[PDB]
Structures are given as structure tokens and as C-alpha cells.
């Protein structure tokens, strides 16, 4: 290739503007580049991972530096309940004087932004107290970023390139990751918690210059190597303990108390240290499973080959799957993305109900922002997991080497799978929408007692099995004489039950008929999104409408107007369709979370209990009611500090609307219009002196779908982010 892109000769000879657009859009698709080999593929990916790590380190270093330079961390650690954390300063020449006055918050001397990422609480909990600590953390992170870049450059050199066989040594990598990357890192973290964080919460200041002179525990490694580990749990912090001071401070370093800290409303630090020690032990044990160099361990290939049921109902079982997984990077990426997307939602659901950072729980805006952020990230990752699974079937799947194993039988009964998913989604949608409309009609006619309100009894029974006593079920932990409650009677049940039965935290919130309908809406969204993605993945290789789909690739526009029409027939188009459903589903769960929490923080849960049973309640008491302060950020009488979010609300609306243009109007209309503009330019005096070098053409069919989806998603994210932050920050719950 003589021009750009240099990795695609076919794109380089394109005489239109499309050469540029596509060159940007296919930069990281190394598999489709000119003269590509497997060794080059693996080495390029290995190098790119180092750059991604360097970017991650630089971002954290920037955050730390700006908090230390322009923040109010030292004033915040003395009044966490009454000081607004500062992210960074503002220097905009476009600001007017009222904007300069309105944005001077905290204790700053100029316009600043209030941080809603929760970094202040996280850093305060882990022992950081002064601006110098953040300054020296930022330098270390910059050093790490530089070293990652250096390693990325080094392993690209001729004498340090790793071979393909090294990248395919799954057993050694699994052993090292399970034992070193997971186990040893957790042991180091609990070491930090024992040595710095826990002393820090009791008024002890431990740093690099004195950590070799201070005993983390009075007994000092005696009990550990003797065996009487209980001496590390004897004297925990009292319930009257104040965080950061020695008032009511104990000496224990590893406990099993359960529940929350009375003042900080978060998990005990000793419980966290014990948890990380236990997880480190578990991962260190698990990292000794696979055979590497010493004649002991397991072979994953033999394990997969030996797991064939003798009855023959699974065919050849898992035989041969080791080679398909090991030789396909898309299979590995899909598995990793599915697991990571599951645990991102797990983190989101566990962080709001079991806060781990000091004084996070009563910072409502930060909690809402974090939950929404992590749930939307999980939603995108889960779509990626299915997209790459679909790509695997086209590019890497070998039907002959996978004869009658568990992976071919899925393609065998794809129709049975897709039809049943369709039935489930249809049933859920029909009945949820019907119940919602019935309740709406009853509320319209002035007869709220005719509503169909189903009690979520299964989930209430599960809550009562965890010890909640608001429903009077008396099962398992809610019972007094059972074996389950008797077993943990004196270890963790007291604190856990006290936290669970405390009705002003987010631990097992009371649920009613309003939750039953929204949970089924969430289930319908999940089922429909999985239906779209699974249908796209299982039909990627071909169907009755297009038997030779695998011959055209993962992303192609169509097969033309013949055979009735073939719009959106490629597997990429299934992902493009499923992104809308993922966004809708995540919006539903975030609406539910935000409305359920904003009413609980206001002291009136009954507003949500009665108004969530019909959709007009959602429209009026959640959207309309909570947009009064946001839309008043700037008005003909002045402005306040909420003007940024008011501007971003309309910005997101505008981008969302602009995306509809690319999603509705298609290419030929625009190409025929661009022809006229080309003629007009060629016939205009004093403009004939200027000539284009790339022929102007309309956006491609697939390019326009991507552009419209990007605009749709950007508007969707920005509008809700502005609304959520402004609504939770106008009143602070």
C-alpha cells in the first residue's frame, strides 16, 4: 500500500473519501490486514495490551495529580459529611461572571467541579490522608505507565519476540494467573490493609519511613506460625469507634463480625482483610492444578476429551474443544467478555448494598453514578461477548474438527433454541405490558382498587431466608431454633441480622407489587436481547435465505433486493439491532434503581410503592417531578451551578435526535444529492481554483448504521447522566 491505510492495499486505491473513513475503522482488525501471519498477530496483540495498560495507569495518575493539586482532600477528611469533594479546577475563557460565582464550590477560590466518582472515600479508606501521599502515588503510577510502554516496545524487538507456541501454553499461563495474578495480589492487598489501612483507621500513621518499626499486631507473627490464629480476632473495634481516631479502637486485624460500621455505614476493615486472605489462599491452592514442567498436574485437552457421557446424548461431548478454544482468539475473547460482563453487574449490585468505603452510602449522587456507570459498562461488554462469539463461528470454526461435539449440536438445534427464546420473550412482553395497561386504565377511571397487584412472594421468602423479618415468614435465618441460625449464632449472624433488619440502608430493601412488574420487565429485556444475539450468532454461517453467509464475512451490507429483500441479514446487523435492546434494558434497571433510592432517601417510600404500579406514575412522579430543578439550571432570570447538566441534557437530546437521521434515511438519497453539490462546486467562479483530492461520496450502508448507533448511544448516555446527576444533586436525596 502506497497511501493510507498502509495495512490495506485495497483501501489505499479507493479514489473517494471512503478510503479515510474505513482506514480509521479497521485499524485494530489485525486478522484482515495485508500479509498478516499468526506470529505477527500474537506479537501485535501482546504489544497493544502494554499500551492499554500504560493508558490505564496514566489516567489514574492524572486523577490523583488533579485531586492533590486542585482538590480539597485535606479539608474533606476532616468533614466528610459536609465538604463537597473537588475533582479539578475550571479555566474556561467563555465563562461569564455569574458562571464564575456559581461554580465556586467547596472551599475553592475559583470555579471547580464536584467529584462524583467516589475516589475521595476510596483513598481515605485505604489510608491516604495528605496531598503529598496522592502526589507520590501519581509519580509511581506514571513510572508504571512508562515501564509498560518500555516493555511493549521491548517485546516487539527481534531478540525478545515471543513465539506462537509460547502464547498457546495455556496450562502455565493459567497456573501463573490463578496463583500469582490473583492469589499473590490478594495477599499483598491484605498485607497493605493490615499494615497501613487498619492502623490508619485507628489514628496510627504508618508510611514507608516507619513501617519497619511499628508492629501491626501486639503479638507479632507469633500466633501465625504457632497456630493459635484466634489471637488476631480477640479485640475488635467497639461500636462507638470513630473512624480515623483512637476513640474506641481495638487491636484485632482479622475478624468475622459482619454487618456495617456504625459511624461510616460500611464494611469493617478487618473483615475485608480476612476476606482477602481467604481468597488469596483459595487462589494459591487453585493455581497448582495444571501440568507445566514437573510431571504433576492436569492437561486441559485430556480433561475435555474424557468428559463424554456414555449415553451419547451429548454426542462426542467436549472432545476436541481444546484446539478450537486455543486456536481461536475470538472464542477466548467471547468467554472473557461474558465472564467480565457478569462480574461487572455483580460489582454494581454488591457495591450499593454492601458499601466498603468509609462515608460512602450517604453520598447519594456518587452511589447512583457508580451503579449506572458499572451497569452500562456491563451491558456493553455482554453485547461484545456475543458479537465475538458470532465472529468465531465465521472466521475460526472448523466443522470437520468439531464433529458431533457439544458445539455442533447447538448449530443442529438452533431452530429449537431460537423459537423457545422467542416464546419466552413474547410471553413476558405480552403479559407485563397487559398488566401495566390494565393498571393504567384502572387509575384513569378513578378505581385504583381494581388493579392487578401480584405480591413478589418468592423474593420476599428468599429475603426472609436471609433473616429479614418484615414479612413474618420465619424460615431459616429468620427462625430462632433452626440449625442454620444456630450454626452462625455467634460468628456473623448478630451483625448481619442487625444490618439486614435496619430499614434505612440499601441491604435487602422491602419489595412490593411495584417491584414484581419491573423485575419481569427486566427479564423480558434480557430474554429479547439474548434472543437477538443468539439468533445472530447461530445464523452467522448461513440460513435458508442466505445459505452461503460465511462466504461474505462478519460485516457486509446485504445480499441485494432479490429473494424478497435482504436488509440487515449479516451477523453484524444482529449486534447492531441488539444494542438498542441492551440500552433499553439497562435504562429500565437504572430507572428502577434511581426511583427506588430517591424516594427512600427522601423519607417517603410510599411514593414509589403506589406510583410504580402504572406507567403514568413513572412518567409523572419520576421523570416530570425530578426534572424541575435540572431544567432550571439557566432561565431568563439567571443561572446556578446546575447549568452544566441543563446544557448536557439538551446536548444529549440533540445527539440522540441526530442519530435518527442516519438510522432512518439511507444512502442513495444522499449520493444523488452530493452529485449536485459536486456540479455546483465545479461551476462556481473563484471556487474552481480549489479542487478536492478525494471524490466526495455518501457514507456506506454499514458505516451509516455504525454512525447512527454511536450518536444514539452517546445521546442516551449523556441525557441520563445529566438527568441523574442533576436530580440527585439538586436535593441530595
Amino acid at each position: 500500500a502506497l497511501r493510507f491505510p498502509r495495512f490495506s492495499q485495497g483501501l489505499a486505491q479507493d479514489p473517494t473519501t471512503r478510503r479515510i473513513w474505513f482506514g480509521i475503522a479497521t485499524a485494530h482488525d489485525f486478522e484482515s490486514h495485508d500479509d498478516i501471519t499468526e506470529e505477527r498477530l500474537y506479537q501485535n496483540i501482546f504489544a497493544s495490551h502494554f499500551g492499554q495498560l500504560a493508558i490505564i495507569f496514566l489516567w489514574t495518575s492524572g486523577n490523583l495529580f488533579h485531586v492533590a493539586w486542585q482538590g480539597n482532600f485535606e479539608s474533606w477528611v476532616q468533614d466528610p459529611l459536609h465538604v463537597r469533594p473537588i475533582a479539578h479546577a475550571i479555566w474556561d475563557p467563555h465563562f461569564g461572571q455569574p458562571a464564575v460565582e456559581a461554580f465556586t464550590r467547596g472551599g475553592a477560590l475559583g470555579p471547580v467541579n464536584i467529584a462524583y466518582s467516589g475516589v475521595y472515600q476510596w483513598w481515605y479508606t485505604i489510608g491516604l490522608r495528605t496531598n503529598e501521599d496522592l502526589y507520590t502515588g501519581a509519580l509511581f503510577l506514571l513510572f508504571l505507565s512508562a515501564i509498560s510502554l518500555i516493555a511493549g516496545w521491548l517485546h516487539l524487538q527481534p531478540k525478545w519476540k515471543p513465539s506462537v507456541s509460547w502464547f498457546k501454553n495455556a496450562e502455565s499461563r493459567l497456573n501463573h494467573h490463578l496463583s500469582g495474578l490473583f492469589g499473590v495480589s490478594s495477599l499483598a492487598w491484605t498485607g497493605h490493609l493490615v499494615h497501613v489501612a487498619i492502623p490508619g483507621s485507628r489514628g496510627e500513621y504508618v508510611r514507608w519511613n516507619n513501617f519497619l518499626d511499628v508492629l501491626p499486631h501486639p503479638q507479632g507473627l507469633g500466633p501465625l506460625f504457632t497456630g493459635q490464629w484466634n489471637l488476631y480476632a480477640q479485640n475488635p473495634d467497639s461500636s462507638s469507634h470513630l473512624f480515623g481516631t483512637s476513640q474506641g479502637a481495638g487491636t484485632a486485624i482479622l475478624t468475622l463480625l459482619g454487618g456495617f460500621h456504625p459511624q461510616t455505614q460500611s464494611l469493617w476493615l478487618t473483615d475485608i482483610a480476612h476476606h482477602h486472605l481467604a481468597i488469596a489462599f483459595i487462589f494459591l491452592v487453585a493455581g497448582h492444578m495444571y501440568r507445566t514442567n514437573f510431571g504433576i498436574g492436569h492437561s486441559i485437552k485430556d480433561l475435555l476429551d474424557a468428559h463424554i457421557p456414555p449415553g451419547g446424548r451429548l454426542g462426542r461431548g467436549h472432545k476436541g474443544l481444546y484446539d478450537t478454544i486455543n486456536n481461536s482468539l475470538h472464542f477466548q475473547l467471547g468467554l472473557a467478555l461474558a465472564s467480565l460482563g457478569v462480574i461487572t453487574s455483580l460489582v454494581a449490585q454488591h457495591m450499593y448494598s454492601l458499601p466498603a468505603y468509609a462515608f460512602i452510602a450517604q453520598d447519594f449522587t456518587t452511589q447512583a453514578a457508580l451503579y449506572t456507570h458499572h451497569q452500562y459498562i456491563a451491558g456493553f461488554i455482554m453485547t461484545g461477548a456475543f458479537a465475538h462469539g458470532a465472529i468465531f463461528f465465521i472466521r475460526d470454526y472448523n466443522p470437520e474438527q468439531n464433529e458431533d461435539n457439544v458445539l455442533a449440536r447447538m448449530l443442529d438445534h438452533k431452530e429449537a433454541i431460537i423459537s423457545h427464546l422467542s416464546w419466552a420473550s413474547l410471553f413476558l412482553g405480552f403479559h407485563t405490558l397487559g398488566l401495566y395497561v390494565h393498571n393504567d386504565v384502572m387509575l384513569a377511571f378513578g378505581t385504583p382498587e381494581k388493579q392487578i397487584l401480584i405480591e413478589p412472594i418468592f423474593a420476599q421468602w428468599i429475603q426472609s431466608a436471609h433473616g429479614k423479618t418484615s414479612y413474618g415468614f420465619d424460615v431459616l435465618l429468620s427462625s430462632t431454633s433452626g440449625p442454620a441460625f444456630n450454626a452462625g449464632r455467634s460468628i456473623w449472624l448478630p451483625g448481619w441480622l442487625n444490618a439486614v433488619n435496619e430499614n434505612t440502608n440499601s441491604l435487602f430493601l422491602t419489595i412490593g407489587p411495584g417491584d414484581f412488574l419491573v423485575h419481569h420487565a427486566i427479564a423480558l429485556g434480557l430474554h429479547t436481547t439474548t434472543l437477538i444475539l443468539v439468533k445472530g450468532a447461530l445464523d452467522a454461517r448461513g440460513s435458508k435465505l442466505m445459505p452461503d453467509k460465511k462466504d461474505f464475512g462478519y460485516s457486509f451490507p446485504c445480499d441485494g433486493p432479490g429473494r424478497g429483500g435482504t436488509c440487515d441479514i449479516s451477523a453484524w446487523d444482529a449486534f447492531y439491532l441488539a444494542v438498542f435492546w441492551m440500552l433499553n434494558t439497562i435504562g429500565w434497571v437504572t430507572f428502577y434503581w434511581h426511583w427506588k433510592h430517591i424516594t427512600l432517601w427522601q423519607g417517603n417510600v410510599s411514593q414509589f410503592n403506589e406510583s410504580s404500579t402504572y406507567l403514568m406514575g413513572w412518567l409523572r412522579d419520576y421523570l416530570w417531578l425530578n426534572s424541575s430543578q435540572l431544567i432550571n439550571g439557566y432561565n431568563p432570570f439567571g443561572m446556578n451551578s446546575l447549568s452544566v447538566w441543563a446544557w448536557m441534557f439538551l446536548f444529549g437530546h440533540l445527539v440522540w435526535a441526530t442519530g435518527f437521521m442516519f438510522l432512518i434515511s439511507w444512502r442513495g438519497y444522499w449520493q444523488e444529492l452530493i452529485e449536485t453539490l459536486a456540479w455546483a462546486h465545479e461551476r462556481t467562479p473563484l471556487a474552481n481554483l480549489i479542487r478536492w483530492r478525494d471524490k466526495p461520496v455518501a457514507l456506506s450502508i454499514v458505516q451509516a448504521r455504525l454512525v447512527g448507533l454511536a450518536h444514539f448511544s452517546v445521546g442516551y448516555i449523556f441525557t441520563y447522566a445529566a438527568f441523574l446527576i442533576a436530580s440527585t444533586s439538586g436535593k441530595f436525596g
Binding site: 502506497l2 497511501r3 493510507f4 479515510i20 479546577a89 479555566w91 474556561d92 475563557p93 483530492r693
Partner: peptide, 29 residues
Amino acid sequence: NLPSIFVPLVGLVFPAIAMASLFLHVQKN
């Protein structure tokens, strides 16, 4: 001090230099 100098550099000067360089790169040959 620094923001009054750095903000114009990152917001105007650096994007202009990068755009000029990238345009000259993509118009080559």
C-alpha cells in the same frame, strides 16, 4: 499560572498541529 497557558495549548494549538500533520499524512501519494 499554568492553566491560562496550558488550556489554549491543549484545546487549540495541539489539535491544530495534529490535524495539519494528519491531513498531510492522509493526502500523501
